[PDB]
């Protein structure tokens, strides 16, 4: 059956994945024991009668978190050989994963995918989950995504990245790790959903009114976005869109494929009690500079493509009127050569909800994914952070000493410079 395969690389994607497959078990009504007391075929296989097994792969070079998944809640629902564990972590080095230590896991990983992909035709795509800044997510993420491009040249593969924020970076070598990442994550991938962390920090504090969150609240909130993204692959509706025609709609030219996200509503039981989330205003909150999840004001950029999966009860009256309102807004400027900009999607299944989480049950949700030119400075900001540190060779010898060469750092320079040059070329 038609299906989609999930890949989690590194400490970031792993516990995102922990938040991910928790919901999907609850969406389908399967208990953590593994048994319930065709719609799920796109994410779960069958083991005999009544047992459902996740179709994902986990991949990390250190067992400090891989073991934590295995001895956790999902001892029986998961699979032991589904999780891949190495020996030593790449430790914030692009060179450790992509060059030296990664090779012993790629042969083990390739075998797993090939064993999972061959059985049933009509696969749709892949789902990466990694941090750009972390070493394994950048390193071992790349060579696996490089190798998949060569083998299955035919095939779609989505990326989900946790880009470094303008203030918070939580590592000294984030500018080196990122600019090296995107040179080798421009060409190989198709579409990469950019996310920042301090963006969601201000999300939790403003709408969801919690003054200090931690990772289990970040991953719980990204799990709602990805579930709203891919419900159309799972369940039916009036109008659904899959992986393969996201890139048709959103990517006009092969370089410009880094885009943002926003989700409405993000409202607790505090205010789900107190107002409608009507279609005339949930789309307004979606376009608000608060609700975007990639930490850059879209005022100093030009929108070029938007994609809007309404999930839950929306009658088409409200869609059309709401769409027309957005064109009239003068604060939101499209690029002049692109008259249409919106690809509506309305689903009929209600929004999902974690139990005892901060998400309130709402009768309608919108998950907006937006190709804009506001990314232009987010690339130039990291370019500037690269320029300082490269100026006198700091933290180079770690990369050089592992097996990389000085000079491929330079190759990434005109690569990212070309990327900033394209956005300012396109957006005029």
């Amino acid at each position: 059956m038609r299906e989609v395969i999930s890949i989690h690389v590194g400490q970031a994607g792993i516990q995102i994945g922990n938040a991910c497959w928790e919901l999907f078990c609850l969406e389908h009504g399967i208990q953590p024991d593994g048994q319930m007391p065709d719609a799920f075929n796109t994410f779960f296989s069958e083991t005999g009668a009544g047992k459902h097994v996740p179709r994902c792969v986990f991949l990390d070079l250190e067992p400090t978190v891989v073991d934590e998944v295995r001895t956790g809640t999902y001892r029986h629902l998961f699979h032991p050989e589904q999780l891949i564990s190495g020996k030593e972590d790449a430790a914030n080095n692009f060179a450790r994963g992509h060059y030296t230590i990664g090779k012993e896991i790629v042969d083990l990983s390739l075998d797993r995918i090939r064993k999972l992909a061959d059985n049933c035709t009509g696969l749709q795509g892949f789902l990466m989950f990694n941090a750009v800044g972390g070493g394994t997510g950048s390193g071992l993420g790349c060579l696996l995504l490089e190798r998949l491009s060569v083998d299955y040249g035919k095939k779609s593969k989505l990326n989900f990245c946790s880009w470094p924020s303008p203030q918070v970076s939580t590592a000294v070598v984030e500018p080196y790790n990122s600019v090296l990442s995107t040179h080798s994550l421009l060409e190989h991938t198709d579409v990469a959903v950019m996310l920042d962390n301090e963006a969601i920090y201000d999300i939790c504090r403003r709408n969801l009114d919690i003054e200090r969150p931690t990772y289990t609240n970040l991953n719980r909130l990204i799990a709602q976005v990805i579930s709203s993204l891919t419900a159309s692959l799972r369940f039916d509706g009036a109008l659904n869109v899959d992986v393969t025609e996201f890139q048709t709609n959103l990517v006009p030219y092969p370089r410009i494929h880094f885009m943002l996200s926003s989700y409405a509503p993000i409202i607790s039981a505090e205010k789900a009690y107190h107002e409608q989330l009507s279609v005339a205003e949930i789309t307004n909150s979606a376009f608000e500079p608060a609700s975007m999840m990639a930490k850059c004001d879209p005022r100093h950029g030009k929108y070029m493509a938007c994609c809007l999966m309404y999930r839950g009860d929306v009658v088409p009256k409200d869609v059309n009127a709401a769409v027309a309102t957005i064109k009239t807004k003068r604060t939101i400027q499209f690029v002049d050569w692109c008259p249409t900009g919106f690809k509506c999607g309305i689903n009929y299944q209600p929004p999902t909800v974690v139990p005892g989480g901060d998400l309130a049950k709402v009768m309608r949700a919108v998950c907006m994914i937006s190709n804009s030119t506001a990314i232009a400075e987010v690339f130039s900001r990291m370019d500037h952070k690269f320029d300082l540190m490269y100026a006198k060779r700091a933290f180079v010898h770690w990369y050089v000493g592992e097996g990389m060469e000085e000079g491929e750092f330079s190759e990434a320079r005109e690569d990212l410079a070309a990327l900033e040059k394209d956005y300012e070329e396109v957006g005029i």
Partner: protein, 426 residues
């Protein structure tokens, strides 16, 4: 009807056989005292294939136990299912072939053949018409490698229109039991190629690899490892005992495998091989049975099959499984793994669907395959022979008991020739 006489020679054979008779007895459901309970006609209709009624309900197996030292024959007597065997079936040597092929064969063995052939033909002529024999020996030792290969040569000339299959344990790549290893192996190969129809190779260390990885058992004893050979060596002979859609036989797979008479050395694989942890998390079907059975870390010979190309290969499926799902997949693997097989044989593979699954388990396969990947294994035994012959080390222990130096020169020539055909046929 059809009878298979079991002969167990050497220390390894006698150990490996005592576990085999345990697997057969409870596959048929026989109390170790010999009596019957289990209530099925279909497990019972073909029981004369291994056993003989003795008027108290009981079955005594058509097994003969032979060894030149009485040490390990009391081991099977005192141990599990020791009450089942016949006391007349035991034949003792009081001396012991101390890892010396010479006294296994010529000198010490010759005065015990006059007894071991007595019991074998006494069991042979009792039936209507015999079908074959099976012999368990190791080609390391003395009382299995030499004392066994003489019994091979004697019963072959007496009954030339029957067959025999020998389950033989060879030397190892890294670790090395019985430091006079290459002498006993090479002297036995050039005799075994002349007098035996089919030989299933077993190595300790592909077999050590399996229990380390798949079974996940840290400190593996003889008992659990023999239980893994005994299931395979029960699987190859299921079809004689139980009906099925596409039936098979030893002679059925004898003619279907070997192209040319001198190459008949076969690899064994078995599936499923599931630890305790992963047992409830597998949905056993015909697809992944084929993917498990074509795995380099699954065969019981320590040869990587990716070096050579498979010449002929057979699959005795066991249980109730649908048959395009059988045949279409062997088509799949033969087309997909195009470089793994040999071009000049259309339909490299062979199939069989034996209708009764193993006990408790539901869907099983036992893979037997004539590979050319034993190019590297026999060239390993070859250069070990050359290393220990030019220095003439340990030659005195053999030569002094009627051996001849001409025998070793023929043995290497007659075994370097066997290498020649494997490499020739790519």
């Amino acid at each position: 009807m059809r009878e298979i006489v079991h002969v167990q020679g050497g220390q390894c054979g006698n150990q490996i056989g005592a576990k085999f008779w345990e697997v057969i007895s409870d596959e048929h459901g026989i109390d170790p005292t010999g009596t019957y309970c289990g209530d099925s006609d279909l497990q019972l209709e073909r029981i004369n294939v291994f056993y003989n009624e003795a008027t108290g309900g009981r079955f005594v197996p058509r097994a003969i136990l032979m060894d030149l030292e009485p040490g390990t024959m009391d081991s099977v007597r005192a141990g599990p299912f020791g009450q089942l065997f016949r006391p007349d079936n035991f034949v003792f040597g009081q001396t012991g072939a101390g890892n010396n092929w010479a006294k296994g064969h010529y000198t010490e063995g010759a005065e015990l053949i006059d007894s071991v052939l007595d019991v074998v033909r006494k069991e042979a002529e009792g039936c209507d018409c015999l079908q074959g024999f099976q012999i368990t020996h190791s080609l390391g030792g003395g009382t299995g490698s030499g004392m066994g290969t003489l019994l091979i040569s004697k019963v072959r000339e007496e009954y030339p229109d029957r067959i025999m299959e020998t389950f033989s344990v060879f030397p190892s790549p890294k670790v090395s039991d019985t430091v006079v290893e290459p002498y006993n192996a090479t002297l036995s190969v050039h005799q075994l190629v002349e007098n035996a129809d089919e030989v299933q190779v077993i190595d300790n260390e592909a077999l050590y690899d399996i229990c380390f990885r798949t079974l996940k058992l840290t400190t593996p004893t003889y008992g659990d490892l023999n239980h893994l050979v005994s299931a395979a060596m029960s699987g190859v002979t299921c079809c004689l005992r139980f009906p099925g859609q596409l039936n098979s036989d030893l002679r059925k797979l004898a003619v279907n495998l070997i192209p040319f008479p001198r190459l008949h050395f076969f690899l064994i694989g078995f599936a499923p091989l599931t630890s305790r942890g992963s047992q409830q998390y597998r949905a056993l079907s015909v697809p992944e049975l084929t993917q498990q059975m074509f795995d380099a870390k699954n065969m019981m010979c320590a040869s990587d099959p990716r070096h050579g190309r498979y010449l002929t290969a057979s699959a005795m499926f066991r249980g109730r499984m649908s048959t395009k799902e059988v045949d279409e997949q062997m088509l799949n693997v033969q087309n997909k793994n195009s470089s793994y097989f040999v071009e000049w044989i259309p339909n490299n593979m062979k199939s069989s669907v034996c209708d009764i699954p193993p006990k408790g388990l539901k869907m099983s396969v036992t893979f037997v395959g004539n590979s050319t990947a034993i190019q590297e294994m026999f060239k390993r035994v070859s250069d070990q022979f050359t290393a220990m012959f030019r220095r003439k080390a340990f030659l005195h222990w053999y030569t002094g008991e009627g051996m001849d130096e001409m025998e070793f020169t023929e043995a290497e020539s007659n075994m370097n020739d066997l290498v020649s055909e494997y490499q020739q046929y790519q």
